[PDB]
C-alpha cells in the first residue's frame, strides 16, 4: 500500500502493441516492457478518424496537494474497465527531481504507469538526446567564433544557453572561453534544466523527424553586431541535431498498473512551454484508440490554455471534454484557511475557495468544451463538505475519484459521467485567440479573459523586445505566458479568485522553434536547486534492490 | 564505401542462446543489440575461463595503424574454424562523430555492427557515467552552498564536470556566479566524458557493488587544512551507483560474420589504461574458449598498462598477445615522410623496424608469448614485405589481410596464434610491484618498456608524490600519461629513441584506480572541433543518414 | 577661446596674507596654488562667521545651465565693492578631461585659475581618496585570504574599488582568480573615484580626526550571518586617515579678478549631496565677511540636500540663497526643442517658467531668503527677457551678465543679494528630521520639494530599509538618488510635472554619512569614453598644451 512498493506484474508491450494494431516491424523493444513505435504506424492510419480527446487539468495548485496524473491514469484504467478502447498519453519526468527532493511515481496508489524506476531515470533515453542535440548547438555556436566568426555574432548577445538534467544553481551564471586564444572566446552563459530546453519544446510539438529538423534551423542562437538574427540554420546544425534525435522522435509504449496502454513522450515546462507531452504520441493514440486521455501542466489557466492555444492549435485537435481536478483541502486554502488547520471542517472557506474552481469551470467554457469535475478523494474530508462541493458545482458534472485508493474502480463514477457529457454534450472547440492580433492584444485576452485580470503592465525592457520581435517577423505567433502557477495573478500570494489586479510582464523571450515566451515575475527559475538535504545523500542501491526512490 | 557495409545481422537474442544464456539474463535494445546481466558470470563463477589474446600494436603513426580491425579479423578467422571465441572491445565517444567524422567499428570486414548505434547513443552507456560524474560535482557545489559544512577550500576542488562533445569553450570557466543565492564562485572546466574517472572505474570494477564502493574513494578536493574529502564524504556513491545500474551490464553484438562481439566501456590510454571493461571480458572468458581483446595506444602503454592494470586486479593471465604493424608505418620510423610512403624502400624498413622490434622485447618481459601481424596493403610490394618477414627473428610472425579478405585474410595468423598458444606456455607476472616507491614504479616502466636511462621530477612533481604517499595513496599502480608517438615523451623522436630521459612534470592521483603521471602536455582532456566540422555537413534524409 | 583666458595671477602666498594667514599655516604647490592648514579654523574657532550665499539653479537642461560661472561672477561682483568674500567650490574629476573635454573652471571671466591644474592632478587631492578607498578593499580581499577570520561572506561585500577614469570595462568584473595563492574569487567592479564614499566623508568631516572616525563606520559587507562588518572591524581607519593627511587641507586659489577661491573636494549629487567640503567653507566663513558657495544639480537635490546634509551637521544657517536660470532653458520646459531655441517665444517662457517658479517655493520652505538670476544671452532678445522679469513675482530677481562682463555683469545682482541679506532675515531649520521613519523622511522630500503625491517601495526596497532600521542606521538623513532633469524620476517629464509619484527601487546605506535611495537607473557610477575621445586628440607641444 506504499507507492514504490507497487511494481507488480505487467504484460509484454509487444503483446500490448499487437492488441492495439501495431506490427512487429513498427516496434523497437527496450526490455520486455518498453517500446519505441515507428512514426509509420500513424502515417498509415491517418485517414481513420480520431477517437474522443479528453483533457484533464486542475484548479490553481497549492503546496497542499491536488494530484493531476493520479486521476489521469485512474480515469483511463476506469474507462478501460467499462469496456472502452483507450490509452493515456503522458510526459516524461526530469532526472533531477529524483535526487533533489525525491521522485514520486506517475500518479500513485493504484493509479500509475510502469515500469516506475525506469521512467524516472533513463527510461528510453529521450532526455539525453535532447540534452546533447541541444548542447551540440551551444558547442557549434562557440566553434564558429573560435573559427573567425564569419556570420558576425556579438557573443554578448547569445541567447541560446547550454543545458543539463540535474539541479545546478552553480551553473546558472557562468563565464566560458577562458584560457587563451587557444580556448575559444570569453563570454557569459549558463545551464538550464534539460526539460526547459527549447529542443524539448519542439519535440513535443513537431510533426515528424523532418518538421523537427526544420524548426531546429529556425532557432535563434544570438545576434550580429547589427541586431540581425543568426539562426541555428545559419550554422548548418539542424542536420546533426535531428540525427541526435533520430530515435527520440518515436513515442514510448508502456502500460499502467492495470495494463491499459500508455504513451510517455516529451515533457517541458508549463510556463516556458505549453507543458504538454508530444503531439505525436497523442495523434498516434487517437488512431489506435477510441478514447485518449492526456493531461497538461499546472492549473487550467496555464496548461489548459496552452493545450488549446498551442498544441491543439498546431495539430488541428478538437477536445471533446475536460475533467478538472480539485480537492476539498486545497479549496479551503483558496478559501483562506492555513495549511496547518486544513483538516478542520469549514464549509465557508470551502465555499469561498470554490471561486477558484468556479472560474476554471467558466474559463474551460470559453473554449467551448464540456467540463467535468473530479473531486479527488481524501480521509478527512467530510460529507458536510463533499456534499456542499457537489451542489456548489451548479454548472458542470461533479464526481469523486477514489482513483488513488481503489485503482480504476474509484474512477468508475468519473468514467460514467464523462461518457455521459461525451454523449449528450458534443464539443465546439475554438482557440481563445486569433494569430492575427497584436502581441499585447493576445496577452490581454489571456489575462483579461482567463486570469480575470483588469489589464497588463509592461516594462521598458518588455516593450523594446515586444517590438524588436514584431518588426522582426515573429509577431504573429502564439503567446506563452510564463507566470506563477500558484495564482490567477502574477503574485503567488493572491490565492483564491483574485479580483481587481493587473499583470506586469517584465521581460519577453522568443522560441522560434515554436513562438513567444513572456515571463512575469521570476518565473525564470529554469534551473532548480538541490535542497540543503540531498534526497541523494540517502539514495543507495543494494546488491539487488534500490532504496529511497 | 565502408559504411555501405551495413548488411545481414543475426538477432542478438539468438546468439546469446548460441553461447548459452538464460533468456531472462538479457535485456534488448532492438533485435540487434542487447545487454547481458552480471548473473551470467556470477552463475558460471568456477567454470573454466579460456585463452586471452590481447592484440596490441606498434607505435602509432599518420601512415595507418590497425589497432582494431586486425583484432576482429582474428575473430572472423579464429572462430571461422569451429572455435568458441568473442571480441571484447571499446565504445567510441559521441563527440568525435561531428568533429572529424565517424569511422568503421573496427575496419573493413571486421567492423562490429550496427555501426551507427555504436558511434552514437548505443545503449546509452555513456550518459549514465556522464550523469553520475556531473551529479557528484552538482553535490559538491551544492554542498558549499549549504555552509561548506566540511570546511572545503573551493580552490582545491579537482573534480571537474563532463560532456561527451568536443568543446574548447568549456575547458576553463568560472561558475557559481550570481550572488548568495546562486552559489559559490570558483574555477573549473569540462573534460570529455570518456576521459572521466567515473569511466575508468567502470572498466575496472568487479560488479555493481564494487563500483558503488570505488566511487566513494574518489577525491573531489581538500579542506582548508589539506584534509582529503571524497564522494563518500558526500554520500553520493549510492545515487551515483544507481545512475549506472544498467550501464554496469556488458553489451552484446556481432560482426558482419556474426561473431559474438562484446563492446562495453572504453577510456583514455594516457590518463587511463585504455582497456575495455573488466566485467565484459571476465564474463566473455567463460562464455567461450578464447577471448580476442585489445588495449590502448602503442604496446608501450595500453599493453604495459593492460597488464599492470586489468590483469592485476582481475587476476587474469594473458595466455598470449599480438602486435600489429603496417609496412609503411615503420618506414616513417625510417625517416620516410607521409608523402614519401608510396615508393618502395627497404633501408628504412630495417631501421624503422627497430620500432616493432622493441615492443617485441617488452612484450616478452611480462612473461607471455607473442606474434607479429601485418596489415596487407596495395603498395606493400613483395620486395618490402619480404624483408619485414625475416627481421621478426624472435617469435611467430604472420600476414593478416583481414581488411579486405574478411576472416579469410586473418587465416594465416589465426592458426599460428593457436599454434603458439599451444606449444608456448605463459606464467603471468606484473612487470612491477604495488609496494615499490611511487618513483621506483615509474622508474622500471621508463627503463625496460620505454627505453630511458632515468626519470626526473620537477618541484611540482616531488611535492604531489610526497603529499600522496604521506596520505597513503602510495601503494597504487601507476598510469603513465606520456605522449605515445614515441617510446619517449618526445612526440618527435621516432623509431626507437636511445640515451634520452623522461621528466614527470605533474602527478594527478585517481583514488578510484591509480596514479597518473604526465610527462608532456597530455592534458588535452577535451578535443576541439575544426573549421570544417562534420556537423555542418551532416543531414538525415526523410528516410536515412548521409555523411555519418 | 576660453582657455586662452590663462593670464595674470597673484601669488597665493600673498592672498593668504591678504586674508590674514600665518605663513606657517600654508603649504605651496607652485606660486599660484596652496594648501591651508586646519589650524586656521581651529585658531579662529569663536570669531564671527559671515553670510552664506549658496547659489543653486533651475532644473538642468541641454540648453545651458550656469551652476558655476554665475557663482563666481557673484564674487568678482560682490567683493568688487570692498567686501570680504570668497568662493567655496568643487574639484572636477580627472577622467572627463580625456572623454568629453575639460571645461572652464566656472565659465568666462569667473573661471578659477589655473584651469589646468584644477582639471588634472591639482594638488593631488583625489589620489589620496583613491588610494584610501582601494587600500580598504585591498585589506578586505587580503583578509579573506587569511581565513576570513571574521566569517565574512564574499558575496555580500558591497565595497567596490575605484579609479578616476571613464572605464566601462572595469564596471562588472571577477577578481581573486588564480588559486589558493592568488586569493578568493568574488565579483565586484569599479566606480568613478569621485563617486567614492571616501570622498563624501571628505566633504562632510569636521577634521582629520573626524575623518579617521567616520571611515571606521563604513560597511564593507556582512558575515555569513548577516552581521555587518566595517573598515573599523579591519583596523584600516588609521592607515586610511594617513593617506589623507594632506588632502584634508582645503585648497587656496584666485580668480581672473584675483578673488580668494577655495576649491576643496567634490562628490556626486545623486548618490551624494554634491556640496564642496565642510572644512573649506567653515574655514572660509571666518576668513571673510561673506561666502559664495554652490551645491549640486537642480535645487531639488543639491539644494534640498545641501541643507539637510551640510548645514545640518555643521550647524550652518544659509543667510541667503540664489538660483540661476537661462531664458532658453525654460522654453524647453515649454516644449521648445534644442534646435528651436533660437527663435523668440513667450507663451512657452511662461509655462516653462513653472520650473524656476517651483524651486522658488521650496527654497523658501527651508526658512531662507532667495533671489533670481539670468545668464544673459545673445538671442535672449528684450521681448523674451521682459516677460521673465515680472513672472518672478515672489522675491528679488536680477540679471547677471557675468559670463562676458566680468564682475561688472554680476553687479546688478550683487547689490540685491546684500539688499535682501540685510532686510530679509532667515531662521534655518531642516525641512525634515533625523528621527522620522526612513520612509517618512523620503516622503516629505517627495511631497513639498519634488511635487509628488506619494512614494512607493519595491520588494527589494522594503527589506533593505527594514534590514537597516533593525540594525540601527534608521536615524540618518536621506540622500535622494533620483534623476534630476525633472522634479520627478521621469527624466522626460519636463517643466513642473504634476499628479505623478516616485518609486524607490533600491536603498544603499552609506555608514559614513547617510541613506541613498535610488529611483531610476542612477547607478551610472562609472562614465564611458565615446567613439571620439579627447584622448585620441590630445597632444602636448615641445613647449605646451593643445586641445586640453
Ligand atoms: K523519453
CATH architecture of the largest domain in chain A: 3-Layer(aba) Sandwich
**Biggest protein-protein interface?**
A-B, 71 and 70 residues
Number of domains of chain A: 3
Largest sheet of chain A: 9 strands, mixed
Shape of chain A: globular
Major beta sheet, strand line-up of chain A: 1-2-11-12-4-13-3-14-15
Spatial extent as radius of gyration of chain A: 23 Å
| Hetero compounds | potassium ion
**Oligomeric state as shown:** part of a larger assembly
Distance between the termini of chain A: 16 Å
Count of separate DSSP helical elements of chain A: 18
* CATH hierarchy class name of the largest domain in chain A: Alpha Beta
CATH superfamily of the largest domain in chain A: P-loop containing nucleotide triphosphate hydrolases
Proportion of beta-strand residues of chain A: 15-25%
**Total E-strand runs of chain A:** 20
PDB class: ligase
Keywords: thermostable, monovalent cation, tetramer, ligase
Entry title: monovalent cation binding sites in N10-formyltetrahydrofolate synthetase from moorella thermoacetica
Chains A, B, C: formate--tetrahydrofolate ligase
